[PDB]
Amino acid sequence: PTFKHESYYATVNELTPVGTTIFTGFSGDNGATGPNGQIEYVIQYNPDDPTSNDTFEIPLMLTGNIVLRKRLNYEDKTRYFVIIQANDRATTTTTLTVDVLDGDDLGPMFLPCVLDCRPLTYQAAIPELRTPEELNPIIVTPPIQAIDQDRNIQPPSDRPGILYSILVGTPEDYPRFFHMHPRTAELSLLEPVNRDFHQKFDLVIKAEQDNGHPLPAFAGLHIEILDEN
Ligand SMILES: [Ca+2]
Ligand SMILES: [Ca+2]
Ligand SMILES: [Ca+2]
């Protein structure tokens, strides 16, 4: 018997449940062969990839459909090589390469991340007794920014947006003075500040995915009110 292509390829999102049929590429005589309906397919141990035959399974020898037996993880292993035996009841093998696709199992992280990430506290300073027109937008060091820890969601159209907010802060009148744009994390002064009533603000900034699976990250934001001096 003789496989019809030199190689076969398949892709699988890591969120794919066990039980799912993940390859059907032998359908329509595309497997190994006048076809007789007597060629049966089996998965084999691969010295090069010992886990591969534990992870994939062929329930129906005649059909050759590969089903997923164990969960996958894009963040751990991204490529498998499955050896498929094809015997006639009247042997050859081929190699299926299964690539794992990145699924949405992680939320954002604030930048810069320095290894996981150390606690990040952003810095901003506000001169007292000046108008918002003079100061806006407030410069933050380093610039507030978060990215999805899922580094390779495909296509990009599937990628979630990121929403930024102020979860909490002290003193608690921060919302009088500060607004954060949900989509740009831009920070605006709303009113002038007098240092004799307000010296500093410690806020917790939140980044969440906008796709119903928030998985939020958090980061500090320390704002000093600078003395007119
Ligand atoms: Ca994963
Ligand atoms: Ca992922
Ligand atoms: Ca994600």
d(CA 122, CA 226): 16
Q: Is the dihedral of CA 182, 188, 192, 198 positive or negative?
A: positive
Query: Separation of 216 CA from ligand 2 center, angstroms?
Result: 15
d(CA 28, CA 35): 10
How many other CB atoms are found less than 10 A from the CB of residue 198?
17
Per 3-state DSSP, the chain is made up of helix, strand and coil in percentages (nearest 5) of: 10, 40, 50
DSSP string, 176-214: HHEEE-TTT--EEE-S---TTT--EEEEEEEEEESSS--
Query: Separation of 103 CA from ligand 2 center, angstroms?
Result: 4
Query: Separation of 101 CA from ligand 2 center, angstroms?
Result: 8
* 166 residue type, one letter: I
Query: Separation of 150 CA from ligand 1 center, angstroms?
Result: 9
d(CA 14, CA 78): 9
Documented resolution in Å = 2.6
Token pair listed for 200:
């500093």
